[PDB]
Amino acid sequence: DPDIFNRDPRDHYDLLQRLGGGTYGEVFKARDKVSGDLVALKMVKMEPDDDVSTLQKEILILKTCRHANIVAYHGSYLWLQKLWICMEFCGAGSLQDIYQVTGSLSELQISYVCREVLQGLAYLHSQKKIHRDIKGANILINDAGEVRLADFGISAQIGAELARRLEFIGTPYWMAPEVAAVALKGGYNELCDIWSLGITAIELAELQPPLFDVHPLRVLFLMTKSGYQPPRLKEKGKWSAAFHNFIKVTLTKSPKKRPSATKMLSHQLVSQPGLNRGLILDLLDKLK
Amino acid sequence: VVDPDIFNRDPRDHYDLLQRLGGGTYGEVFKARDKVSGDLVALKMVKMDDDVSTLQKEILILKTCRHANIVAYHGSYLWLQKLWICMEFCGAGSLQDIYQVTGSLSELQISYVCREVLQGLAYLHSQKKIHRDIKGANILINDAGEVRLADFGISAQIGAELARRLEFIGTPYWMAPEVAAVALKGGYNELCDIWSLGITAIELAELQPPLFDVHPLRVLFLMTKSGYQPPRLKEKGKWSAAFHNFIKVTLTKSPKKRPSATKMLSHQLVSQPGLNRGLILDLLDKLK
């Protein structure tokens, strides 16, 4: 990035605690020295012969995002062979951090979370960006009960992988048009995030995504078959007909039929009148 | 290990190198002579800490193919960080070597070649392999007048990429089925080879594939536009309706409507009565 600060981040922040890692890098809870504001600092170790493409793409996604439901970006620092990405800190951590203590979320809490995720996805999709890693661990909650999407690590890697494809595709004159399309634009589109939101809604209701206890490779193979059936909520009576229908239309097996994020925002479950941060403040009270 | 049947010896103890033939997708190919048999072979030398995945898959393809329309495989050598793949020497070289000397092939000669290539492709596709690099340079003619497919380097690179993606795909529970499908099977299928054979038939007719004078990046981007129209033969009157139709159907833009190799074997152009090795023996006589 051409706007990177060439100075030690510790000159502006104090490192408080290690939070663990995302798709790549180490994340730290830190404190701004002038305002006391907390921030998250993501550190990625640099090496002289490292391909900078993925990190360059992640910073570009964060920098060009300007939406409430996506983690704010405060700049990046490069110092002593370490890159530090400065992002918004969310006091309650991720929804996975929360439901591991509280148990299942209520339908209204899930509905508010889904509307907030959809506002962030509609924005990302309008800027020709894809998250590709929607899940409870990447949906953060701040102390005010507001929802923010985090970790554009997978998105950055895919973007870099795609740029690499274009650079080594070779002579194209004998290449079929579908081979060219997958090299330039990949084998899928942004509607994959709508499916992941549907799986995330089930995860918030049952504490695990569908088939979580079966081997990872077996799930990938079963999903690729023509007889694959989209998952459903286990307890039928516990959830309203509008929630079951939200799962059925987000989890549409075919991407050509799957509704967009903007279309999903007018769905009854998330366009309901009593949806606000107060529902998540109630969940956070259960945590304390 | 790159190959369990590999010879840990200097191939120069068994072969005399006679001439540099040029390169394939990777490696350098030499014409060589067996010191005891007197037989001619082609030796492909590749410099090999290196990941042996693509060379391992190329040898496996060559080794497990038992077909009259695929270049014969003799064995491999590993000596002083160089891997040497020993394959059949095809006396007339590639179809590109032939048409640049003799000019455009006759419609019957192109028909015979297309039939032979389709037989090799139907065999390869039945064994779950994709060539992905069908072109005049990779179709060889031996002294017996036989048509043999060559250069599985691209196919090996693609198999190595599909294995490298599956190992690093991560947790799949939140992935849309189409995402799981491009990670395990890619965004296209074996029908890409049928399109490449259509382009090759135009290359044998016109001495260049369509749009050869257009910038490679322009050709690629043009294939991803909604109104994209597949290429055709430039000289209508020179070719019969059977050849125009062969081009029309092999170059079907949608892979869902493009016929398989086995289906193409019943096409009017390649099911014609006088398609025999005599046409290729006659082409070879013209080279001398």
Ligand SMILES: C[C@H]1C[C@@H](N)CN(c2ncnc3[nH]c(Cl)c(-c4cccc(C#N)c4)c23)C1
């Ligand atoms: C590594 C995560 C473990 C999770 N338990 C707590 N995470 C957070 N908590 C509070 N504010 C935060 N801001 C940001 Cl951004 C993150 C975050 C969350 C997820 C991935 C990445 C990245 N790349 C960063 C975060 C950090």
Ligand SMILES: C[C@H]1C[C@@H](N)CN(c2ncnc3[nH]c(Cl)c(-c4cccc(C#N)c4)c23)C1
């Ligand atoms: C590099 C090619 C240039 C072309 N002019 C003549 N080629 C051949 N000629 C005679 N017998 C041959 N056997 C085999 Cl295999 C090849 C061959 C052809 C194409 C690619 C590769 C590879 N990887 C090997 C070959 C060699």
